[PDB]
Amino acid sequence: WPNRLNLKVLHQNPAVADPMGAAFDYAAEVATIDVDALTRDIEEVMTTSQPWWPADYGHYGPLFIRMARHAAGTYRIHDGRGGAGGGMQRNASLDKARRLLWPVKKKYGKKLSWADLIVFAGNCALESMGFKTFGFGFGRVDQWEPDPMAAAVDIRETFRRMAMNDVETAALIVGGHPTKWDNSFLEILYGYEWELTKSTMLATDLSLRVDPIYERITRRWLEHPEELADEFAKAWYKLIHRDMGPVARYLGPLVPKQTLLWQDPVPAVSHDLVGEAEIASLKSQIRASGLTVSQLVSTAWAAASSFRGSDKRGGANGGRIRLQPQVGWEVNDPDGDLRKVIRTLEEIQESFNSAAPGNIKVSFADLVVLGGCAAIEKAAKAAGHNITVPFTPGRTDASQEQTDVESFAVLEPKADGFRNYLGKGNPLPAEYMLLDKANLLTLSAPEMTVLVGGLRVLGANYKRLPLGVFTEASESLTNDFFVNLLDMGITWEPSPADDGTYQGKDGSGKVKWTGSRVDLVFGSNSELRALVEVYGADDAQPKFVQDFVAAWDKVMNLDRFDV
């Protein structure tokens, strides 16, 4: 029970339990919402008072604000999950505000999900208390399954765990007071008699007065409330929109044109895109250039594995692998063959852009994935079967100033199972971290198994370790990993030099393979051996290739939201 590797965490939100069907997109519907008519309904609900729960001060504004803040106050950067865009099992007194909004959800039904309705109720409450917010973006599909200086540091830490700076933390604290700039929160907390303490009576937020950096931050706002009104606008925006993905995922006509630093923005498509006859002119140009299949697949997977299917940030778009925060990570081994791949895939970019049919310019963030797909095509063609990996271009390269080291320092994988990376600070073993990594990328069990089996053989291993590889000749996409694992002629033992690896004796005289910990799980766990026995049969060689191509393509197209 406790130590059982549960595969149920992969199909956590299936399509069988969705009451909407397969053919149902949340992007063609909320764009048709007339927010000018929805705000009237929200105003009516805010003004009225229902008898089953009386209206505090005859107004539901503050309740909606607290519901919105509490719904988007459970975000955590280390894992990404939580936030507002999720299901989060939609306290007690804050589970009735979800049922005080039914008169609005009833008029729309499917064109306005709860995850949008609650947060929009909060934002409209802010706009009704006399505040000019920054904007709003719909499109949060909801899952269908579940003393001062002693607390001052705690406040600075709790917000620091929610990707919140110091000035923005102060803005969020002061804004909640609710935000109407009439109660004069900071206007009295700084000009009041100090004999009135715990020992009118103030609250326990006296940290804002006594903490040095907090007091310095609030000194500006004491005499310049306009900067407070502007800083709370960005703080609220960040609070309710941290969970959602790139800027291209924002819907509705209320979204503001001004792009921010924390969205991880990328430049728009300032040119034409590469056609179909031209990508075949690049694939044959990607090879015959020096790069083998190992380097190309490692580079391509190293830029699209940073995705996080919880807050939908990271991914292959933008092409930040060439930039600073990721070309320095240990898993993307910088002193190895990464500074050479990056330089090689820029001469091709320069050469192609020089001699191009007009203005058909391709970006580096596109060339990296194109090189990966060309490498897989070559590897497959070297193993009998031939296949063309499908491709959806349109990525753009982001400059150094668009990204941010501090925000990207959390995306560093503490352990990457598909590449046998295992650093330090690993409480869980290497199997559960593989499961979590596959859950973040929105991978299903067959997809996870086929991806591991393909990546081991292809060459994507940390520092090209001989671990995992169960093939007599690499640089060829075969199912030889599954066949040699399900094979029962070998005998597995813990390694003599005990460091977490294993050793597969061939039974008779010698040692053939050298396994690992995130590898023998597939050969041991029955629920995964059931899939290994499917991909490692006699006839199912083409099935493995087709499934690997499909899973690879879906992983690469994970973060493609504009198309």
Next chain:
Amino acid sequence: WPNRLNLKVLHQNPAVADPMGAAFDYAAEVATIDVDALTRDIEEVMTTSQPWWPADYGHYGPLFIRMARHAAGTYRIHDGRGGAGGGMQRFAPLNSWPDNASLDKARRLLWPVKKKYGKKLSWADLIVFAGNCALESMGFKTFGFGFGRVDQWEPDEVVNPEGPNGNPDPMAAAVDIRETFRRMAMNDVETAALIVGGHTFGKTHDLVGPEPEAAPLEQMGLGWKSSYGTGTGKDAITSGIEVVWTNTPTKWDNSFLEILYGYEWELTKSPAGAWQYTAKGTIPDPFRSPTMLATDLSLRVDPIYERITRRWLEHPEELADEFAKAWYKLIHRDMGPVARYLGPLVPKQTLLWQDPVPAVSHDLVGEAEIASLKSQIRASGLTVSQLVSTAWAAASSFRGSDKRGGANGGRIRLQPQVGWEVNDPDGDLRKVIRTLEEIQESFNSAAPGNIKVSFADLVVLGGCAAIEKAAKAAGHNITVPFTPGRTDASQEQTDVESFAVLEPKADGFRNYLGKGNPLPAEYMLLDKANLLTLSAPEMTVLVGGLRVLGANYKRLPLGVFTEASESLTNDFFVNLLDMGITWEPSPADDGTYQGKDGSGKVKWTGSRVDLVFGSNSELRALVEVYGADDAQPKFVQDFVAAWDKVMNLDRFDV
């Protein structure tokens, strides 16, 4: 469960964790394998001895027979879950019991066969076929076999060998054996046949390792790795008994009987464990006095088993027949109607426990003549409530974990079904049946050609016509799909005993709640919706439709949140989420809540199952979909789809 209804049971084994894909039907694959090639592969795998698990007598056959038994010996009738066709004797919850010890090394011996076919031979099928072919290879003309037990890639959530926990008394063990074989619907003669002819093949076998559930990963999913001796073979420890029954453990003959009836069987103690019976003879060693267990020796003292066994001592052909029939019943117990047995080995003769529905003997009606039957049904005075209740009662006695029951056969008129409590036999069922029979007679006497309708079709046809009429009265001009091809089976083709288990002790779709149920009504409704293979939205829409239609037990008001009955509308959903009413447990406290409509009026009335949808946090998210202002057509379409899912659920011919 203590609390927190687990709606993850309604979608277990989904189409996501399924490597084969979506467009893959097993019945179109296994019907093409050369079964002779499969036999020549299995009969060769059970001969070459692997070095990591040496074969006793150089013949794995008995191990395969034991594996086949233990794979289908977990089938329990009282719910139908578990057994052969499931395939869960391979996943974690079942490969860790001490009973199924050394039954994983057995399941890995068949890999050199499964790999040769890959996807045209399921594991849950290959295990049982390997058992049957091992039985065949030792000189035993078995009854038959039928492929088509699809594997499932996710574990679902569903006897001592010495006596009642340390009491080697055949008097004590005999009753336990009889009960644990009643639990699988076995008779007494069939139980004796299984115990005798299953232990004629093979032999039995502290300081062992952990189960594969918690074994080290270098074991490769195995377990129970013993350190005594070489560990595997000639010292193998799997049940710690070390008994050899038959004179030749690799050949079929009645040598069990003369041994168990030509000795006196003193009591001894095994090296590992204890409590085995020994005579006060010589059996060839795999690589010894005649010994017997306590359960096996129970067949010599129990008077009920005494007559059967001592008669089998004189005429062995009776044993040769009864064991074959019992084995056939065992491995095919939970695979379903005879229409699912595909493969060139299926027998032609039918059996009573198969619940046989006779084959059609007339031209089936078309989708051009049913426009007259639907008119006649709706023009016969029968209300929508009666037709819907009859149709649901016909198609609610189905078990998706056992594939038995269902609408086909037309049992709703025969004895075991018409007399149950949930589908009242007082004026409700006994009146609809007469009118339906009259209508079928009128149609058949005036048929165009040889086209003839069967009564088993008319119950579903009347249900469909009633639903169409209700939807037309609500304001939608839809038509409900219907596929004919059902037949009516006579009374002597229905085992009255075998349907007593099918009686629904609690049916959440009709507010029926009897006695003896452990869990409350909500969990019973969840289990019912799991048996019919219904997802959460399908269950919600079915409940919401059946409440308003009027298919309650005794047509009680407990759940009809509508003042306009006989009208298929979502009024059960919009009025449930009406937060302007306040609920209150009734002073009678009979489990029937009631909603005081604002001031003092007790307008509605509910039940513990009709209020879960408005209380459970994750199950209200579905009610809030169909309860919107515009999702009336969506609700109607989803209800029709779920109704077709329930009606055409046992149809395997189509």
